[PDB]
Write a protein that holds these residues in place. Structure first.
Motif, PDB file in Angstrom:
ATOM      1  N   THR A  36     -31.472 -40.776  -8.491  1.00 56.25           N
ATOM      2  CA  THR A  36     -30.407 -40.365  -7.536  1.00 56.25           C
ATOM      3  C   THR A  36     -29.503 -41.550  -7.168  1.00 56.25           C
ATOM      4  O   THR A  36     -28.805 -41.465  -6.125  1.00 56.25           O
ATOM      5  CB  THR A  36     -31.001 -39.701  -6.294  1.00 56.25           C
ATOM      6  OG1 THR A  36     -31.748 -40.647  -5.526  1.00 56.25           O
ATOM      7  CG2 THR A  36     -31.858 -38.498  -6.641  1.00 56.25           C
ATOM      8  N   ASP A  38     -26.782 -43.131  -8.987  1.00 52.63           N
ATOM      9  CA  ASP A  38     -25.347 -43.001  -9.367  1.00 52.63           C
ATOM     10  C   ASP A  38     -24.857 -41.576  -9.080  1.00 52.63           C
ATOM     11  O   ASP A  38     -23.683 -41.427  -8.731  1.00 52.63           O
ATOM     12  CB  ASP A  38     -25.123 -43.395 -10.829  1.00 52.63           C
ATOM     13  CG  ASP A  38     -25.535 -44.823 -11.177  1.00 52.63           C
ATOM     14  OD1 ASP A  38     -25.796 -45.623 -10.237  1.00 52.63           O
ATOM     15  OD2 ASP A  38     -25.606 -45.130 -12.404  1.00 52.63           O
ATOM     16  N   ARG A  39     -25.722 -40.572  -9.225  1.00 53.05           N
ATOM     17  CA  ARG A  39     -25.448 -39.155  -8.875  1.00 53.05           C
ATOM     18  C   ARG A  39     -26.800 -38.473  -8.620  1.00 53.05           C
ATOM     19  O   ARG A  39     -27.834 -39.143  -8.826  1.00 53.05           O
ATOM     20  CB  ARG A  39     -24.650 -38.453  -9.980  1.00 53.05           C
ATOM     21  CG  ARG A  39     -25.323 -38.500 -11.347  1.00 53.05           C
ATOM     22  CD  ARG A  39     -24.428 -38.099 -12.500  1.00 53.05           C
ATOM     23  NE  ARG A  39     -25.220 -37.717 -13.666  1.00 53.05           N
ATOM     24  CZ  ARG A  39     -25.751 -36.513 -13.861  1.00 53.05           C
ATOM     25  NH1 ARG A  39     -25.578 -35.554 -12.968  1.00 53.05           N
ATOM     26  NH2 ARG A  39     -26.463 -36.267 -14.945  1.00 53.05           N
ATOM     27  N   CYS A  40     -26.813 -37.234  -8.134  1.00 50.03           N
ATOM     28  CA  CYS A  40     -28.070 -36.441  -8.088  1.00 50.03           C
ATOM     29  C   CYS A  40     -28.343 -35.974  -9.532  1.00 50.03           C
ATOM     30  O   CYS A  40     -27.532 -35.210 -10.080  1.00 50.03           O
ATOM     31  CB  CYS A  40     -28.001 -35.251  -7.138  1.00 50.03           C
ATOM     32  SG  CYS A  40     -27.503 -35.623  -5.426  1.00 50.03           S
ATOM     33  N   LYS A  41     -29.398 -36.461 -10.177  1.00 51.46           N
ATOM     34  CA  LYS A  41     -29.769 -35.916 -11.505  1.00 51.46           C
ATOM     35  C   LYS A  41     -30.167 -34.461 -11.308  1.00 51.46           C
ATOM     36  O   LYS A  41     -31.056 -34.214 -10.517  1.00 51.46           O
ATOM     37  CB  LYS A  41     -30.922 -36.696 -12.119  1.00 51.46           C
ATOM     38  CG  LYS A  41     -31.310 -36.160 -13.488  1.00 51.46           C
ATOM     39  CD  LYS A  41     -32.197 -37.126 -14.261  1.00 51.46           C
ATOM     40  CE  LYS A  41     -32.278 -36.703 -15.716  1.00 51.46           C
ATOM     41  NZ  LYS A  41     -33.523 -37.166 -16.372  1.00 51.46           N
ATOM     42  N   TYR A  92     -24.831 -35.403  -2.837  1.00 51.91           N
ATOM     43  CA  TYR A  92     -24.977 -36.869  -2.988  1.00 51.91           C
ATOM     44  C   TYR A  92     -24.351 -37.564  -1.779  1.00 51.91           C
ATOM     45  O   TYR A  92     -23.217 -37.245  -1.440  1.00 51.91           O
ATOM     46  CB  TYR A  92     -24.283 -37.322  -4.274  1.00 51.91           C
ATOM     47  CG  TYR A  92     -24.349 -38.806  -4.546  1.00 51.91           C
ATOM     48  CD1 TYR A  92     -25.446 -39.356  -5.187  1.00 51.91           C
ATOM     49  CD2 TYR A  92     -23.314 -39.660  -4.183  1.00 51.91           C
ATOM     50  CE1 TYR A  92     -25.537 -40.713  -5.438  1.00 51.91           C
ATOM     51  CE2 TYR A  92     -23.384 -41.020  -4.438  1.00 51.91           C
ATOM     52  CZ  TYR A  92     -24.498 -41.547  -5.071  1.00 51.91           C
ATOM     53  OH  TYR A  92     -24.594 -42.882  -5.322  1.00 51.91           O
ATOM     54  N   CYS A  95     -29.731 -36.270  -1.992  1.00 50.46           N
ATOM     55  CA  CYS A  95     -30.116 -35.365  -3.113  1.00 50.46           C
ATOM     56  C   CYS A  95     -31.371 -34.596  -2.693  1.00 50.46           C
ATOM     57  O   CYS A  95     -32.322 -35.240  -2.231  1.00 50.46           O
ATOM     58  CB  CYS A  95     -30.289 -36.139  -4.418  1.00 50.46           C
ATOM     59  SG  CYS A  95     -28.799 -37.054  -4.909  1.00 50.46           S
TER      60      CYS A  95
END
Ligand SMILES: [Rh+]
Ligand SMILES: [Rh+]
Length: 124
Positions: A36, A38-41, A92, A95
């Motif tokens: 989590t 750089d982004r919410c996977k 985000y 997350c």
């Protein structure tokens, strides 16, 4: 320079619990394993088997990978796994995930010498 083998262990191995610890598990583990940052996977699977037993899948049932490569392998036995799935209201950097436990055959992609798992393709 994290190795591909070590990236698979960080993203997909959790041998220290038999099954989805609790309803909190994916919220904790998606964050602690750095999925989590750089982004919410959006979706990610953790496997609750020994490293030796997951590494051994690289000599089990050879199957086509989703991307059409030939280096994927299906476990002959079912494994304890946790699927983590981003909730529709997850925003985000906060997350949020649903934690779901299953017992399924895993499919992994294997590369290198030693020949070891580098990618989680599917469960079936
Ligand atoms: Rh991958
Ligand atoms: Rh990848």
């Amino acid at each position: 320079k994290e190795t591909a083998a070590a990236k698979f262990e960080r993203q997909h191995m959790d041998s220290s619990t038999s099954a989805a610890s609790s309803s909190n598990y994916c919220n904790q583990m998606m964050k602690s394993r750095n999925l989590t940052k750089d982004r919410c996977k959006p979706v990610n699977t953790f496997v609750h088997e020994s490293l030796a037993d997951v590494q051994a899948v690289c000599s089990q049932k050879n199957v086509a990978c989703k991307n059409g490569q030939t280096n994927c392998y299906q476990s002959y036995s079912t494994m304890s796994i946790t699927d983590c799935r981003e909730t529709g209201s997850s925003k985000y950097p906060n997350c949020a995930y649903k934690t779901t436990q299953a017992n399924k055959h895993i499919i992994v992609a294997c590369e290198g010498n030693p020949y070891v798992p580098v990618h989680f393709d599917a469960s079936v």
